[PDB]
Structure 1
Amino acid sequence: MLIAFEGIDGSGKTTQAKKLYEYLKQKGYFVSLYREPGGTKVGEVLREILLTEELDERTELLLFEASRSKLIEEKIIPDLKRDKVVILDRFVLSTIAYQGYGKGLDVEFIKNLNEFATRGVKPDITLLLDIPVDIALRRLKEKNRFENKEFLEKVRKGFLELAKEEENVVVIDASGEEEEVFKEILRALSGVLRV
């Protein structure tokens, strides 16, 4: 069982992912929660580089994938083997939406690169937290984060197109309040998990 949250910054991926983690453990499941990039010793150091160093979009993409690669081989695959419910804050769709639709890199090449890093491991379900950029931005400012509106509009559209073209993605209206967004997530999850 692999559950992946996707969506633009400010969509509430980290908060909802944590809510789900606590919720499922309480129900008796063995669960893991990882963030991308990061999640492993090597992955976290790369996270630093990515968020502090001046990088061209290509080196950036390669570093995101190397982090993903390490996380997959070191923790995700072994977790799934032990029947743990793995929850990901961000995953493959975001790489495509940001690097592809946002920065202009080739989507098929990104898909091929994602495939390589994850050894073909895909989510049983992907929760796309959709939300208008303006609301996402307000929420980010509350945490003193300021993102590029123009860039995010492109990324938002990218996610929505991806939600149509591929398997197991449920679009969640993440514009509402926390508990309501979370309840909508549980309902989408009732289709793969019994809650």
Structure 2
Amino acid sequence: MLIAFEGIDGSGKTTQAKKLYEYLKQKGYFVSLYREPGGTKVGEVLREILLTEELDERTELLLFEASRSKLIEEKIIPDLKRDKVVILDRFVLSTIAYQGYGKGLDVEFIKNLNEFATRGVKPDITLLLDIPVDIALRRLKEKNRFENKEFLEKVRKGFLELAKEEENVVVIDASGEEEEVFKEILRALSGVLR
């Protein structure tokens, strides 16, 4: 297996996760790629609620966890049982960084919810795509995506603290060009996977 991509909006997660998916398929792995929230029919409904409705921060946390629970039970656990490489575009560190460090919700509580939703399933490696917020925001602005700079500075700092506190997290310099970032990822992956 399980490879998680983490990092702020605009760090290149969706781009890199797709590159890694295609690369590992070509190398002969059986691989799955899922996004969080989403990745199942029910999860995609919850994703649309999360991205379109005005929600309070507590309802948001519970819906992220509900989407994760469905994806874990429906797809990830069955995939891992069949020795598929599962790549996730976001996972439990995003919930801690955004809902905990960003929104101020209790992190011990978030971690208990994460454990409940995941049944204790943990990544073999987490690739934290680290990038200065101003650089990320300029990438996003090009595609008419806007995120709050004050909020994301807290989240960025939170991810970096988590890379020291949580297990199996490798910090990737995501400021570089696409192929350069991918090479860094492949170097990090050689720590857990042929």
Which TM-score tier does this pair reach, normalised by the shorter chain? over 0.9
Q: Deviations over 1:103-124 (max 9, x none)?
A: 0000100000000000000000
**3-state SS of paired residue (2:147):** coil
Q: Which runs of 5+ in 2 are unaligned?
A: none
* Superposed displacement of residue 166, structure 1: 1.3
Mapped to 1, the partners of 2:134 and 2:176 lie a distance apart of: 13
1:177 aligned residue: 177
* Superposed displacement of residue 142, structure 1: 1.2
**3-state SS of paired residue (2:146):** coil
* Superposed displacement of residue 193, structure 1: 1.0
Mapped to 2, the partners of 1:138 and 1:53 lie a distance apart of: 25
Mapped to 2, the partners of 1:48 and 1:5 lie a distance apart of: 21
Mapped to 2, the partners of 1:33 and 1:134 lie a distance apart of: 28
**3-state SS of paired residue (1:4):** strand
Q: Deviations over 1:105-152 (max 9, x none)?
A: 001000000000000000000000000001000100111101111100
Mapped to 1, the partners of 2:147 and 2:167 lie a distance apart of: 29
Mapped to 2, the partners of 1:16 and 1:65 lie a distance apart of: 24
Q: Percent identity?
A: 100
**3-state SS of paired residue (2:140):** helix
Mapped to 1, the partners of 2:147 and 2:126 lie a distance apart of: 24
Runs of 4+ in structure 1 displaced over 3 angstroms?
none
Mapped to 1, the partners of 2:165 and 2:27 lie a distance apart of: 33
**3-state SS of paired residue (2:104):** coil
How much is the aligned-residue C-alpha RMSD, in angstroms? 0.4
* Superposed displacement of residue 180, structure 1: 0.2
Mapped to 1, the partners of 2:116 and 2:152 lie a distance apart of: 27
* Superposed displacement of residue 89, structure 1: 0.1
Q: Deviations over 1:39-90 (max 9, x none)?
A: 0000000111111111000000000000000000000000000000000000
Q: Deviations over 1:143-164 (max 9, x none)?
A: 1101111100000000000000
**3-state SS of paired residue (1:134):** helix
Q: Which runs of 5+ in 1 are unaligned?
A: none
